Design a protein around this ligand. Sequence first.
Ligand SMILES: Cc1cc2nc3c(=O)[nH]c(=O)nc-3n(C[C@H](O)[C@H](O)[C@H](O)COP(=O)(O)OP(=O)(O)OC[C@H]3O[C@@H](n4cnc5c(N)ncnc54)[C@H](O)[C@@H]3O)c2cc1C
Ligand SMILES: Cc1cc2nc3c(=O)[nH]c(=O)nc-3n(C[C@H](O)[C@H](O)[C@H](O)COP(=O)(O)OP(=O)(O)OC[C@H]3O[C@@H](n4cnc5c(N)ncnc54)[C@H](O)[C@@H]3O)c2cc1C
Lengths: 388, 388
Amino acid sequence: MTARFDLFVVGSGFFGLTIAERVATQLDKRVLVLERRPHIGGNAYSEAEPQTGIEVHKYGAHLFHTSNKRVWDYVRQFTDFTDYRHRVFAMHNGQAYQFPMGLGLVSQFFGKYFTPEQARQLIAEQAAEIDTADEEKAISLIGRPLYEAFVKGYTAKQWQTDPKELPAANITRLPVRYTFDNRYFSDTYEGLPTDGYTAWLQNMAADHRIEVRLNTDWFDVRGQLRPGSPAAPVVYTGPLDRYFDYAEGRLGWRTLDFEVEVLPIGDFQGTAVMNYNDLDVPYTRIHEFRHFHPERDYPTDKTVIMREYSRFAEDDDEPYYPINTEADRALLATYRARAKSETASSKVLFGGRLGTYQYLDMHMAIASALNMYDNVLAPHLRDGVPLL
Amino acid sequence: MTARFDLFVVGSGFFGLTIAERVATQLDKRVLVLERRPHIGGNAYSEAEPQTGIEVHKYGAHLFHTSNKRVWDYVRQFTDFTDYRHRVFAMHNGQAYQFPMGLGLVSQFFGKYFTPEQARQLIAEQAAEIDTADEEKAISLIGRPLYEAFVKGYTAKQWQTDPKELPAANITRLPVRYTFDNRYFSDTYEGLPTDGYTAWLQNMAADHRIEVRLNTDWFDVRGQLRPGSPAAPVVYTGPLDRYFDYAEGRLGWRTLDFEVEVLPIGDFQGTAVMNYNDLDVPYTRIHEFRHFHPERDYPTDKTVIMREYSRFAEDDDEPYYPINTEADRALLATYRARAKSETASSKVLFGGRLGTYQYLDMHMAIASALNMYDNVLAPHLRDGVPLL
Ligand SMILES: Cc1cc2nc3c(=O)[nH]c(=O)nc-3n(C[C@H](O)[C@H](O)[C@H](O)COP(=O)(O)OP(=O)(O)OC[C@H]3O[C@@H](n4cnc5c(N)ncnc54)[C@H](O)[C@@H]3O)c2cc1C
Ligand SMILES: Cc1cc2nc3c(=O)[nH]c(=O)nc-3n(C[C@H](O)[C@H](O)[C@H](O)COP(=O)(O)OP(=O)(O)OC[C@H]3O[C@@H](n4cnc5c(N)ncnc54)[C@H](O)[C@@H]3O)c2cc1C
């Protein structure tokens, strides 16, 4: 029997699309990508806002960075990168602060300049208030003043829970920089895709051997599709608990809501991203998208901002970050065993952030897929090797 | 009569080494560079400090930047560049501030966050205290409070004059940035030479057709050199007024003193460069040289700092920045007429910061040299075209 496709990929985020592109192009195979949303790219999807023309990241700000030379070389086949270098500011009590915690924030907050060494001693003294051994571990690492100003209100909004009520294991290191360096990321390579994320994502899928089906949920079509390509493996990047119909209970997740507003002014905040650390401000962050692409010709009489909000994901909400409690990890342990049998019996592989129950940045999602490809999928499809 | 040299160059700064390298290399000519100092490079000269091995810019911090692609291409034949991006902080009243003046400093100084528009309005208000048309012009541009904090004591220590007694025309514009962007330079290309300035400078002079004599003043040797190479032009990059025996008077310059200190700590200030704005601090700036090269394996227990002091130059001080009074400009106009006579009668060309009485950045010095090479020197040496 002639097969219609050689591989199915469920999900068109960076993990799915990396899988699909390597298999199409390197093995010369036919791939079908099923995407349940109205567009490709998963949460890295971007779109120009109509009134301004400004490219908006639809599901929050997506900053690209890596120290992996392979990933860097790979991504630049599909896009050029800009020389953008990410910096973040924090708003606390009507004042904007250099961020993350370093000499700049420390001198601003405490009202005078501290030397690298005077700052080391200052933090060590305030942190001494609680021993890390026995509000949190946070205080025990950075002191009560820095905690109550920059970590308490912001954690309470992210988790939608009082920090006294979250596990101490949640934080392992809460470092202060003892230098004035406020470059957010510390990786070798960084920038924004010059023509945006959506152009990059399409170029990943542009090969003629890759078909993408939008508005198509895998659980609606899998029974109509596999019979016609019965030997094709399935690379599944949707929710792991959902794959098994939630039989063992639901994995806990946190969502985000976004309010995009267009303002009749050129510049709302003078930077790309402002953290709002205070509990009395309902959003965690404001993004101002013009500052992501200074090099573009954007109108100077208008701007687009996005307010980002965290909440408790109800059943139905889009999953973004794992809550990862002790009961979630037993449940993940359970579903991992179920997945391992589904690989042996049905050729379904589990990958990506949802398939795996892990937060993954883009570069880690791409490297993960390159690994799945090199070690699991390429040996199976090209040679004979079992998928297990 | 057989010539010993095809060209003489006086001074081995960036202007003079550019001239010398282009003529030696492109035209196949023998060049003699006379340098009065014990080392080449002029003021861009750098050296390893003995106790730590940290490379010190001997005559002040030198940061390379250009928007001129021809120059960027040219300079990369002799050195690689680092990804360093210059930022400057300012110390005022025991507190460290983001610099230059923008949203970061404005919010720090006044102790509340100002929106881009709110900060435009604030500065418009305060600067309305004095009209520019009719202390300084400075107050009329940025208002009294930011002038008295960040400009008053700094200009005073630089010029060694109360600003009440300095020309209004000495400030053209005094811009406040209405974003949080604190990158100091605005050029396309920026970085530090990977192997330092001295390695870069030595490479420019490396061709076998270039001869350098150090510890040699032109005025001592010119009479014994020119008879043997009578047709060689001279490119003079030394002081303009010194060339003509100061016979019309002396051009006014400002000098700098540098105090190098090795300290038994790993980090003194957490950044490359700290400006000291207060009048009651005798020095103008502290450079800390490890932060110019974080990619190097510098000791974590020792550090080199340099304090920079500005003063009234005396007759036998090193010239750095032109004073540029209306009387200097008339003096300059007189010497430029003397210079042009000298070009006509004995083939002496005047170039560089000293030979021209101008402050010149490295890249503008290099571009100016390429211009004299293209348009004046090469057609003379190649074809016989007059120098004027
Ligand atoms: C708020 C936000 C900000 C982020 N910022 C950054 C950043 O700054 N830098 C960075 O490196 N990373 C960032 N990330 C991560 C980035 O989005 C990654 O690319 C992604 O998290 C991991 O890739 P993925 O392909 O596994 O998942 P996804 O991008 O989520 O792809 C999954 C796709 O599968 C689809 N799908 C699910 N179930 C089905 C089904 N049953 N049938 C068909 N399709 C299905 C979904 O619709 C989705 O399109 C951010 C993420 C979020 C949530
Ligand atoms: C405080 C300081 C900081 C600076 N920072 C920067 C910076 O950050 N970025 C930047 O781009 N530029 C900077 N510059 C400018 C930089 O040094 C340039 O390279 C220079 O100003 C222009 O080059 P030049 O060759 O004309 O001058 P010079 O480097 O001064 O060259 C003049 C040479 O001529 C020699 N000479 C003079 N008379 C005689 C004679 N009679 N006989 C023999 N030799 C003679 C001198 O000894 C000297 O070596 C800085 C300069 C100073 C002083």
